[PDB]
């Protein structure tokens, strides 16, 4: 009854979804074949909950997911890999040619040839569910598909569904690190097109996770598998309130009424405190106060920003494991009196608390340690206004000389659409300066 | 010896479909949406939140005579007295660029009126000096030049070339020498008939190729003068295609390729105008990005002056590309040009 | 189902293509007979990109050979890998080009390109989805410089929205081989600038220097040069037929490397390259590979990068490696050498990674660059052209076949315009 559909777009989306569904299968006892021998231990078990999996009469558990990608290189690896029997064989491929880091091809030219299948599968999955609580769309700014196809699909879903929640998980471009020359253009066009369709778009930066892996986990040569595992842990911490039971369960629909004050400002940061390897799992207490303090440190942020250069607007702390409300209240009281962690003058409450009794899982062959308790912080703050501005500085430098523009106009776009995508973003920046000034009377 | 580039603006009247909704729905408050442009005077201009200045603007109720008298006289007078001058249209789909520059047999455009006045001036000056004319008419489509007067020639043979003097000259171009206004009307009508267009859409008058008409005027003495008064000159009328967004056309076939090439050519023209306007980008102006800007090498800033007629719409849906046209017009107004006399035979 | 159609024009193109198919067959595990004796499944999952399947588990290359003299075709047929090619695409004439661009583009090439286009259509219509074409030719001779350009123009007319590539062996600065190199080079560039999308410039002297200094080879034959070219030719598509963390196709590299349509001339390179007696004294890691790649001594074109600035650079890695290492190393290279990079492009590097390295190495990396220094090469021709055109040294052989001086003037003007275009962005801000 608490179900929610997941969609993944592009290479980044598919590779994050691999880790996400590996984690879900590990947590709920489902094997890669889709079976569930956990019923042997307890008769009539419900470990493979109906939130993320659909059960057939034969004992299988097919996942609720729609993997879509233009190029046939990542989905084929899933069809050949070890999870080939888990997913429904309707993993959608255009199978012809990639978007080539072009927003126009992902939106106008090639995206229009495959969107109908996506909508049909989403309709079937929605009709299977009794009442779905929202959509979880995984993508990444900078890629052609991740921008264009995500924007097109969100537009069509808002036309079709509307009031249903639509949350995002996006890999924002880093200020210095990058792997694409035309990435600022795609990011700017995406934020223009997908500002009035989403409801809460979480952001993640690759450079921040690299720094976290270097400092805490002590991995000097990480790859994308570790980043995907950390993002999987974030999403599992978010969704733990639906599958299991706890003292305070935060539903998906209650995220919005506690994190977004105004409709346009819906870009919060996400952080995971107890990132510790098995070697340093010892010599540490890992109490509620310690993890709560670690969540607010600049060094443990998963998005490259300095919260000290801005004011926190809202915070939502989702705990897991052995946690008592008194310890959480003590941690919040300790945090509030600190003068470095500022808050807006129009939010005396500030924090939302959620507690769940299921501890975090551990994937074999990973690097995260087994911890009794964990916490995930989702914070809406004004530091993000810096991260936009840098990207805007990368836009105006290139658009001034009209560089890399002939591809976009040659694949069905007008130059003016660029300028709008700047101006709207500028307005958003102004909003983040209009909601930081202290009130007067 | 230098001249000044010229810019003018025109706006169409509401169509029947939008005007009907305007009278029904939005008239009560005062889709038939509100008037964004709201022209404030003859020279300046206002938009929803800003203000600009262009030369000799026109309202939706303006007449052909007013625009002809306000844009063409310097070009006509210069071209007849040697020199060089041109005119070219700009804007987006549905802004009426093919109506003002060409017109209909009952609503004639700038071409008919300016060439008829040239013929009348030739008749008037016949007692003084003899004048002859030559004509050519071509289109640019999908990065290919096509001749609208000799369609049998293939696009393979049509190619632009230049010598050490850097003078543009098209090969195998059909240069036609007329004798009367009826003949040139026949040529113009046949060329417009053979123009590439999209009759699939409801607006079958939609042009999907850049049309270029070139008229050369030459002079010669009457009675007994010995190798005097040659004084050739060139004039060109250019009709560009629109920059319709792909969002406005869900169905996409060969029209996709046509629109892509049209937008690439328009972007090349915009880059050329921006390069010319900027002081320190004068080291090189990218004329070679498309055939269109290559053919207008001398027209832009080489040895000639031109009139940029930008066409807009009053519908509220048409906002962003109208602003793009306004910005590009502003920089097109800031480019200079030189002007020199013609060769004399001896 | 992305696939590529290969064409080979002239002696240089034919030899490079022969070595290229020799390399690719070993990469995918195919014999001279055309059967399969690989070991891994990944070699057959994307075999359709280059090869075409046949009856008895056989595989025929999708290559089209063309040259006006039959000697090179007989040499290739007598070679070891001559049987895999289908006999029906061995299109040839009888009268050679004679190192004359007019004979290859106007007189004799026109009498043979129809068959080539028929073969190209036959190969292309069998495709489920076509990514683009790729051609190998030399810009000094007559067959290459004429027929390759004519075929490129006609294919672009028939297939406008597909990628066209060229691996052109540009004329040498010092040691030439034909007296009429400048005319052929200028007339071929006049078409390449208009038609192609990725022109990979290569120079013989750079290959000789690489062979003498890096590889420490005493007697580098043409086979070694063809090997060096084939290494890069089989690296710009590794992500298009193997899995990887961050994939990349020909169009993705085209978009991230061509800021303006006329700037599509690229300098390639390959790493690791070491002597056979010095591989036990080196640690094969990402920093060593990037140091070897970005060094001017490893470039495959004579033009020095340090005489200009990089507009856009691309790096295709092959093997298992950390993305943090790659990102950190490219950022460090950009920061340290900021004088050699363009300001108005914030990030100049486009990285791609593939998980399957070559047969006998644990790591490899193909470098591509778009440098303003390439203008120098054109400038050299623009001198060697005019010194011969100001006196009409060897011009009657060209006018006797149909051409006129207008073509020569137009080609010179286009080359000078390209040089000025590069010089504009070299010193802009
Ligand atoms: C133990 C070891 O490292 O063996 C190497 C080797 O010793 C060195 C010296 C090899 C060797 O290469 C040369 O000596 C050479 C000669 C002329 C031109 C170019 C190279 C090698 O011949 C080259 C050969 O390379 C390959 O097999 C690659 O897969 C290559 N394919 C072919 O060379 C090939 C040629 C004919 C038929 C089938 C395959 C390749 C490269 C790029 C992309 C695809 C394939 C290998 C493993 C070696 C030897 C054998 C000594 C080097 O070559 C390459 C391309 O890897 C030169 O320095 C590199 C790396 C090594 O240090
Ligand atoms: N966190 C994370 N980010 C990734 C991963 N793979 C790619 N990215 C990011 O994605 C960005 C570029 O988009 P890609 O994922 O490579 O490809 P895409 O988004 O699907 O766009 P296309 O090229 O059209 O397919 C890069 O800047 C990467 O930072 C991944 O496995 N994990
Ligand atoms: N000022 C005007 N008054 C009345 N009717 C007009 C006016 N301008 C244009 N029209 C008519 O409106 C219709 C659409 O304009 P049209 O001239 O087709 O624009 P266009 O420039 O041809 N579009 P494009 O094909 O993209 O260039 C035409 O049939 C015109 O005759
Ligand atoms: N790399 C390489 N280059 C070659 C080879 N043979 C010739 N060339 C180059 O190609 C040029 C001659 O072109 P050629 O192949 O004779 O053209 P064609 O006669 O018209 O087919 C010379 O400048 C050489 O540098 C070869 O085997 N390998
Ligand atoms: Mg991709
Ligand atoms: Mg028109």
- Which among C168, C166, C148 has a CA at the least distance from the CA of C97? C148
**C219 lies in the same domain as C340:** no
B11 touches B59 (CB < 8 A): yes
**C297 lies in the same domain as C401:** no
For residues A362 and C394, give the distance between their C-alpha atoms in angstroms, rounded to a whole number: 77
Q: Compute, in angstroms, the gap from residue C379 CA to the centroid of ligand 4.
A: 22
Residue B51 within any structural domain of the chain: yes
- 3 state SS of A2: coil
C260 touches A401 (CB < 8 A): no
For residues C268 and C366, give the distance between their C-alpha atoms in angstroms, rounded to a whole number: 7
**DSSP β-bridge partners for residue C163:** C132
For residues C404 and C427, give the distance between their C-alpha atoms in angstroms, rounded to a whole number: 37
A310 touches A383 (CB < 8 A): yes
3-state secondary structure chain C: CCEEEEEEEHHHHHHHHHHHHHHHHHHHCECCCCCECCCCCHHHHCHHHCEEECCCCCEEECEEEEECCCHHHHHHHHCCCCCCCCHHHEEECCCCCCCCHHHHHHHCHHHCHHHHHHHHHHHHHCCCCEEEEEEEEECCCCHHHHHHHHHHHHHHHHCCCCEEEEEEEECCCCCCCCCCHHHHHHHHHHHHHHHCCEEEEEEHHHHHHHHHHHCCCCCCCHHHHHHHHHHHHCCCCHHHCCCCCECCCHHHHHHCCCCCCCCCEEEEEEECCCCCCCCCCCCCCHHHHHHHHHCHHHCCCCCCHHHCCEEEEEEEEEECCCHHHHHHHHHHHHHHCHHHECCCCCCCEEEEEECCCCCCCCEEEEEEEEECCHHHHHHHHHHHHHHHHCCCCCCHHHHCCCCCHHHHHHHHHHHHHHHHHHHHHHCCC
**C212 lies in the same domain as C274:** no
- Which among C49, C45, C75 has a CA at the least distance from the CA of C62? C49
Question: Which token pair is C255?
Answer: 């978009």
Distances (CA, A) of A322 to A142, A285, A378, B96, B255: 40, 13, 20, 72, 63
Q: Compute, in angstroms, the gap from residue C224 CA to the centroid of ligand 1.
A: 11
C61 touches C21 (CB < 8 A): yes
Q: Indicate which residue's Cα is closest to atom 12 of ligand 3.
A: B96
Tell me the H-state helices in A311-401: 325-337, 384-401
Resolution in A, one decimal? 3.1
> Regarding beta strands B169-170 and B160-161, do their DSSP bridges make them parallel or antiparallel, or are they unpaired?
antiparallel
> Regarding beta strands B336-338 and B2-4, do their DSSP bridges make them parallel or antiparallel, or are they unpaired?
antiparallel
For residues B220 and B125, give the distance between their C-alpha atoms in angstroms, rounded to a whole number: 11
Burial class (CB in 10 A: 0-12, 13-18, 19+), C235: buried
- 3 state SS of A333: helix
- 3 state SS of A138: strand
For residues A261 and A347, give the distance between their C-alpha atoms in angstroms, rounded to a whole number: 10
Question: Which residue is associated with the tokens 């996006």?
Answer: A170
B146 in contact with ligand 3, CB cutoff 6 A:
no
> Regarding beta strands B130-141 and B210-220, do their DSSP bridges make them parallel or antiparallel, or are they unpaired?
antiparallel
For residues B54 and C174, give the distance between their C-alpha atoms in angstroms, rounded to a whole number: 58
For residues B72 and C152, give the distance between their C-alpha atoms in angstroms, rounded to a whole number: 45
For residues C408 and B268, give the distance between their C-alpha atoms in angstroms, rounded to a whole number: 26
Distances (CA, A) of A70 to A89, A91, A100, A111: 16, 11, 10, 8
- Which among C15, C7, C224 has a CA at the least distance from the CA of C121? C7
Question: Which token pair is A319?
Answer: 């705990």
Residue B346 within any structural domain of the chain: no
Ligand 4: atom nearest CA of C146 is 20
Exposure of A304 in the CB half-sphere (CA atoms within 13 A): 19
Residue B203, sorted as left (phi over 0), alpha (psi -120 to 50) or beta, turns out to be beta
C32 touches C81 (CB < 8 A): yes
Phi and psi at residue C293, to the nearest 5°: -65, -50
- Which among A74, A121, A108, A112 has a CA at the least distance from the CA of A93? A74
Residue B149 within any structural domain of the chain: yes
Residue numbers in A near B250 (CB within 8 A): 112
- Under an 8 A CB cutoff, do B252 and A413 touch? no
- Which among C278, C181, C273, C291 has a CA at the least distance from the CA of C235? C273
Among the partner-chain residues C160, C414, C421, the one whose CB lies closest to the CB of B257 is C160
**What's the full length of chain A, in residues?**
441
> Regarding beta strands A134-139 and A5-9, do their DSSP bridges make them parallel or antiparallel, or are they unpaired?
parallel
> Of the residues C203, C227, C256, which one is the last residue of a structural domain?
C256
A168 touches A200 (CB < 8 A): yes
**C37 lies in the same domain as C14:** yes
By the CB < 8 Å criterion, does A401 face chain C?
A: yes
Exposure of B297 in the CB half-sphere (CA atoms within 13 A): 19
- 3 state SS of B163: coil
Determine if the peptide bond prior to C12 is cis (ω within 30°).
no
- 3 state SS of A428: helix
For residues A257 and C129, give the distance between their C-alpha atoms in angstroms, rounded to a whole number: 48
B99 in contact with ligand 3, CB cutoff 6 A:
yes
Chain breaks in chain B (C to N over 2.5 A) after: 30
**C22 lies in the same domain as C112:** yes
B147 touches B155 (CB < 8 A): no
- 3 state SS of A81: coil
CATH number of the domain within which C411 lies: 1.10.287.600
- Which among B211, B197, B322 has a CA at the least distance from the CA of B255? B197
For residues C383 and C389, give the distance between their C-alpha atoms in angstroms, rounded to a whole number: 10
Distance from the B55 Cα atom to the nearest Cα atom in chain C, whole angstroms: 33
C347 in contact with ligand 1, CB cutoff 6 A:
no
Contacts of C132 (CB under 8 A, 6+ apart): C4, C5, C162, C163, C164, C165, C197, C250
Q: What is the DSSP letter of A400?
A: H
> Regarding beta strands C59-61 and C51-53, do their DSSP bridges make them parallel or antiparallel, or are they unpaired?
antiparallel
- Which among C106, C15, C132 has a CA at the least distance from the CA of C67? C15
A198 touches A163 (CB < 8 A): no
> Of the residues C224, C256, C288, which one is the last residue of a structural domain?
C256
**C222 lies in the same domain as C90:** yes
Written as one string, the DSSP assignment of B205-264 is: T-B-SEEEEEEEEEEE-SSS-SS-----EEEEEEE------GGG----SHHHHHHHHHHH
Tell me the H-state helices in chain B: 16-21, 27-29, 64-71, 73-80, 97-101, 110-124, 181-194, 254-277, 291-295, 297, 320-332
- Which among B345, B304, B306, B346 has a CA at the least distance from the CA of B329? B306
**DSSP β-bridge partners for residue A185:** none
CATH number of the domain within which C295 lies: 3.30.1330.20
Exposure of C195 in the CB half-sphere (CA atoms within 13 A): 23
Q: Given a contact as 3+ CB pairs under 8 Å, which chains touch C?
A: A, B
Provide the number of structural domains found in chain C: 3
- Which among B28, B299, B207, B157 has a CA at the least distance from the CA of B285? B299
Question: Which token pair is B143?
Answer: 């990065």
Provide the number of structural domains found in chain B: 1
- Which among A425, A420, A402, A410 has a CA at the least distance from the CA of A104? A410
**C368 lies in the same domain as C384:** no
Phi and psi at residue C189, to the nearest 5°: -65, -30
What angle in degrees, to the nearest 10, is found between the helix axes of A115-128 and A144-160? Answer: 50
What angle in degrees, to the nearest 10, is found between the helix axes of C374-389 and C181-195? Answer: 130
CATH number of the domain within which C248 lies: 3.40.50.1440
A190 touches A182 (CB < 8 A): no
Q: What is the DSSP letter of A343?
A: B
For residues B160 and B68, give the distance between their C-alpha atoms in angstroms, rounded to a whole number: 32
- Which among B191, B208, B187 has a CA at the least distance from the CA of B199? B208
Chain breaks in chain C (C to N over 2.5 A) after: none
Question: Which token pair is B56?
Answer: 């000799």
- Under an 8 A CB cutoff, do B163 and C420 touch? no
Shortest-distance ligand to the CA of residue C148: 4
Range of the domain at C138: 3-256
Catalytic residues of A: 254
Count CB neighbours of B1 within 10 A.
6
Range of the domain at B327: 1-338
For residues C290 and C310, give the distance between their C-alpha atoms in angstroms, rounded to a whole number: 15
Count CB neighbours of C136 within 10 A.
30
For residues A340 and A190, give the distance between their C-alpha atoms in angstroms, rounded to a whole number: 34
- Which among A208, A205, A202, A278 has a CA at the least distance from the CA of A239? A202
Exposure string of C312-330, with b = 16+ CB inside 10 Å and e = fewer, is bbbbbbbbebbbbbbbbbb
Phi and psi at residue A376, to the nearest 5°: -130, 125
**DSSP β-bridge partners for residue B217:** B133, B233
Helix (H) or strand (E) holding A205: strand A200-205
> Of the residues C202, C232, C256, which one is the last residue of a structural domain?
C256
Residues belonging to chain B with any Cβ–Cβ distance to chain C shorter than 8 Å: 142, 161-164, 166, 171, 257, 281, 283-284, 286-289
Exposure of C6 in the CB half-sphere (CA atoms within 13 A): 26
List, in order of start, the domains of chain A with CATH numbers: 1-268 (3.40.50.1440), 269-383 (3.30.1330.20), 384-441 (1.10.287.600)
**DSSP β-bridge partners for residue A203:** A170, A269
Among the partner-chain residues A112, A402, A414, the one whose CB lies closest to the CB of B245 is A414
- Which among A386, A372, A366, A364 has a CA at the least distance from the CA of A433? A386
Residue C367, sorted as left (phi over 0), alpha (psi -120 to 50) or beta, turns out to be beta
Question: Which token pair is C48?
Answer: 């359709």
The distance of Cα B229 from the centroid of its chain, to the nearest Å, equals 30
**C348 lies in the same domain as C294:** yes
Count CB neighbours of A60 within 10 A.
17
A206 touches A230 (CB < 8 A): no
Question: Which token pair is B214?
Answer: 């070139």
Contacts of C96 (CB under 8 A, 6+ apart): C68, C69, C142, C143
Q: Compute, in angstroms, the gap from residue B205 CA to the centroid of ligand 6.
A: 6
Q: What do you get for the CA distance between the two ends of chain B, in Å?
A: 25
What angle in degrees, to the nearest 10, is found between the helix axes of A384-401 and A416-434? Answer: 160
**C238 lies in the same domain as C284:** no
Question: Which token pair is A118?
Answer: 């996506």
Exposure of C102 in the CB half-sphere (CA atoms within 13 A): 15
Q: Compute, in angstroms, the gap from residue C137 CA to the centroid of ligand 4.
A: 8
C162 touches C3 (CB < 8 A): no
Question: Taking the C-alpha atoms of B136, B142, B143 and B147 in order, what is their torsion angle to the nearest 10 degrees?
Answer: -20
Residue B64 within any structural domain of the chain: yes
B217 touches B131 (CB < 8 A): yes
Helix (H) or strand (E) holding B311: strand B305-312
Residue numbers in B near C422 (CB within 8 A): none
For residues C71 and C88, give the distance between their C-alpha atoms in angstroms, rounded to a whole number: 17
Residue B343 within any structural domain of the chain: no
Question: Which token pair is C264?
Answer: 């599509």
B171 touches B159 (CB < 8 A): yes
What angle in degrees, to the nearest 10, is found between the helix axes of C405-426 and C374-389? Answer: 150
Exposure of B27 in the CB half-sphere (CA atoms within 13 A): 7
Q: What do you get for the CA distance between the two ends of chain A, in Å?
A: 48
For residues A25 and A31, give the distance between their C-alpha atoms in angstroms, rounded to a whole number: 6
Ligand 4: atom nearest CA of C141 is 17
For residues B54 and B42, give the distance between their C-alpha atoms in angstroms, rounded to a whole number: 9
For residues B97 and B255, give the distance between their C-alpha atoms in angstroms, rounded to a whole number: 20
B305 touches B5 (CB < 8 A): yes
For residues B93 and B198, give the distance between their C-alpha atoms in angstroms, rounded to a whole number: 12
Contacts of C268 (CB under 8 A, 6+ apart): C200, C202, C232, C300, C301, C366, C367, C368, C369
């Amino acid at each position: 009854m608490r179900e929610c559909i997941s969609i993944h777009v592009g290479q980044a989306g598919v590779q994050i979804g691999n880790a996400c569904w590996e984690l879900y299968c590990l947590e709920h006892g489902i094997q890669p074949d889709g079976q569930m021998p956990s019923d042997k231990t307890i008769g009539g078990g419900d470990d493979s909950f109906n939130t993320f999996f659909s059960e057939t009469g034969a004992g299988k558990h097919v996942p609720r997911a729609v993997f879509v990608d233009l190029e046939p290189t990542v989905i084929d690896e899933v069809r050949t890999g070890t999870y080939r029997q888990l997913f429904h064989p309707e993993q959608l491929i255009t199978g012809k040619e990639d978007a080539a880091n072009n927003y126009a091809r992902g939106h106008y030219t090639i995206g229009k040839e495959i969107i109908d299948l996506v909508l049909d599968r989403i309709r079937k999955l929605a009709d299977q569910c009794t009442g779905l609580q929202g959509f979880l769309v995984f993508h990444s700014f900078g890629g052609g598909t991740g921008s264009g196809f995500t924007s097109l699909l969100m537009e069509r879903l808002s036309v079709d569904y509307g009031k249903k929640s639509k949350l995002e998980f996006s890999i924002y471009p880093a200020p210095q690190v990058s792997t694409a020359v035309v990435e600022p253009y795609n990011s700017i066009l995406t934020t223009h097109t997908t500002l009035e369709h989403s409801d809460c778009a979480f952001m993640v930066d690759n450079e921040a996770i690299y720094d976290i892996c270097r400092r805490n986990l002590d991995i000097e040569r990480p790859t994308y598998t570790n980043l995907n595992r950390l993002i999987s842990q974030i999403v599992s911490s978010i969704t733990a309130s639906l599958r299991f039971d706890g003292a305070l369960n935060v539903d998906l629909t209650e995220f919005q009424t506690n994190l977004v004050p105004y409709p346009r400002i819906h870009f919060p940061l996400a952080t995971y405190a107890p990132v510790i390897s098995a070697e340093k799992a010892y010599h540490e207490q890992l109490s509620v106060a310690e993890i709560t303090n670690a969540c607010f440190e600049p060094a443990n942020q998963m998005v490259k920003c300095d919260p000290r250069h801005g004011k926190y607007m809202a915070c939502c702390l989702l705990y897991r494991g052995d946690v008592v409300p008194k310890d959480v209240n003590a941690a919040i009281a300790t945090i509030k009196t600190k003068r470095s962690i500022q808050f807006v003058d129009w939010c005396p409450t500030g924090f939302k608390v959620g507690i769940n009794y299921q501890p975090p899982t551990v994937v074999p062959g990973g690097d995260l340690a087994k911890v009794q308790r964990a916490v995930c912080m989702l914070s809406n703050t004004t530091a993000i206004a810096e991260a936009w501005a840098r990207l805007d500085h990368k836009f105006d430098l290139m658009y001034a000389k009209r560089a890399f523009v002939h591809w976009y106009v040659g694949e069905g776009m007008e130059e003016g659409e660029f300028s709008e995508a700047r101006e709207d973003m500028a307005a958003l920046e102004k909003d983040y300066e209009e909601v930081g000034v202290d009130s007067v009377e | 010896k230098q001249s000044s580039i010229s810019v003018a603006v025109r706006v169409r009247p509401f169509t029947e479909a939008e005007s009907n909704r305007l009278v029904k729905i939005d008239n009560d408050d005062v889709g038939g949406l509100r008037k964004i442009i709201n022209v404030v005077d003859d020279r300046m201009l206002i938009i929803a939140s800003k203000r600009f200045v262009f030369d000799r603007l026109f309202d939706e109720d303006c007449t052909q005579d007013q625009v002809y008298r306000n844009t063409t006289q310097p070009l006509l007078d210069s071209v007849l007295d040697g020199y060089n001058a041109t005119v070219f249209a700009y804007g987006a789909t549905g802004c009426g660029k093919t109506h003002t520059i060409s017109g209909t047999p009952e609503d004639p455009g700038v071409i008919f009126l300016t060439m008829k006045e040239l013929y009348n001036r030739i008749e008037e000056l016949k007692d003084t000096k003899i004048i002859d004319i030559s004509l050519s008419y071509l289109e640019i489509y999908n990065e290919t030049i096509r001749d609208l007067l000799n369609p049998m020639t293939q696009c393979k043979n049509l190619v632009i070339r230049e010598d050490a003097n850097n003078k543009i000259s098209v090969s195998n171009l059909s240069r036609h020498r007329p004798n009367s206004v009826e003949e040139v009307m026949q040529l113009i009508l046949e060329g417009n008939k053979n123009r590439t267009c999209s009759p699939t859409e409801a607006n079958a008058t939609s042009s999907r190729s850049h049309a270029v008409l070139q008229i050369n005027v030459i002079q010669k003495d009457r009675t007994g003068d010995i190798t005097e008064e040659h004084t050739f000159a060139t004039l060109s009328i250019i009709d560009l295609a629109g920059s319709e967004r792909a969002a406005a056309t869900k169905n996409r076939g060969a029209r996709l390729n046509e629109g892509a090439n049209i937008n690439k050519s328009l972007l090349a023209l915009g880059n050329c105008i921006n390069a010319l306007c900027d002081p320190r980008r004068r080291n090189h102006v990218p004329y070679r990005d498309s055939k269109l800007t290559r053919l207008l090498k001398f027209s832009l800033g080489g040895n000639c002056k031109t009139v940029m007629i930008v066409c807009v719409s009053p519908s509220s849906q048409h906002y962003d590309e109208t602003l793009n046209t306004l910005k590009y017009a502003d920089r097109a107004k800031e480019i200079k040009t030189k002007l020199i006399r013609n060769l004399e035979h001896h | 189902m992305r696939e590529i159609v290969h064409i080979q024009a002239g002696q240089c193109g034919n030899q490079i293509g022969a070595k290229f198919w020799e390399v690719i067959s070993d990469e995918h595990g195919i014999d001279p007979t055309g059967s399969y004796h690989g070991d891994s499944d990944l070699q057959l999952e994307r075999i359709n990109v280059y090869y075409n399947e046949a009856t008895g588990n056989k595989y025929v290359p999708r290559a089209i050979l063309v040259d006006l003299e039959p000697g090179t075709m007989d040499s290739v047929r007598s070679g070891p890998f001559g049987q895999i090619f289908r006999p029906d695409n061995f299109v040839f004439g009888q009268s050679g080009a004679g190192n004359n661009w007019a004979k290859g583009h106007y007189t004799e090439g026109a009498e043979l390109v129809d068959s080539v286009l028929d073969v190209v259509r036959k190969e292309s219509e069998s495709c489920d989805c076509l990514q683009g074409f790729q051609l190998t030719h030399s810009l000094g001779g007559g067959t290459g410089s004429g027929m390759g350009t004519l075929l490129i123009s006609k294919i672009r007319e028939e297939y406008p929205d597909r990628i066209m590539n060229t691996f052109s062996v540009m004329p040498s600065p010092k040691v030439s081989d034909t007296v009429v190199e400048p005319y052929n080079a200028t007339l071929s560039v006049h078409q390449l600038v208009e038609n192609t999308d990725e022109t990979y410039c290569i120079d013989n002297e750079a290959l000789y220097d690489i062979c003498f200094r890096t590889l420490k080879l005493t007697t580098p034959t043409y086979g070694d040069l063809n090997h060096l070219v084939s290494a890069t030719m089989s690296g710009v598509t590794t992500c298009l037929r193997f899995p990887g963390q961050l994939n990349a196709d020909l169009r993705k590299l085209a978009v991230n490397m061509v800021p303006f349509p006329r700037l599509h001339f690229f300098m390639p390179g390959f790493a690791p390259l070491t002597s056979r007696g010095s591989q036990q004294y080196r640690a094969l890691t990402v920093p060593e590979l990037t140091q070897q790649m970005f060094d001017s001594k490893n470039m495959m074109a004579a033009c020095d990068p340090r005489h200009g600035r990089y507009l856009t650079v691309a790096a295709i890695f092959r093997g298992r490696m950390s993305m943090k290492e790659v990102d950190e190393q490219m950022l460090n290279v950009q920061n340290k050498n900021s004088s050699y990079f363009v300001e108005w492009i914030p990030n100049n590097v486009k990285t791609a990674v593939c998980d399957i390295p070559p047969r006998g190495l644990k790591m490899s990396a193909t470098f591509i660059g778009n440098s303003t220094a390439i203008q120098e090469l054109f400038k050299r021709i623009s001198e060697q052209f005019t010194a011969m055109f100001r006196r009409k040294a060897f011009l009657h052989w060209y006018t006797g076949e149909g051409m006129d001086e207008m073509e020569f003037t137009e080609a010179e003007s286009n080359m000078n315009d390209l040089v000025s275009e590069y010089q504009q962005y070299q010193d802009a801000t």
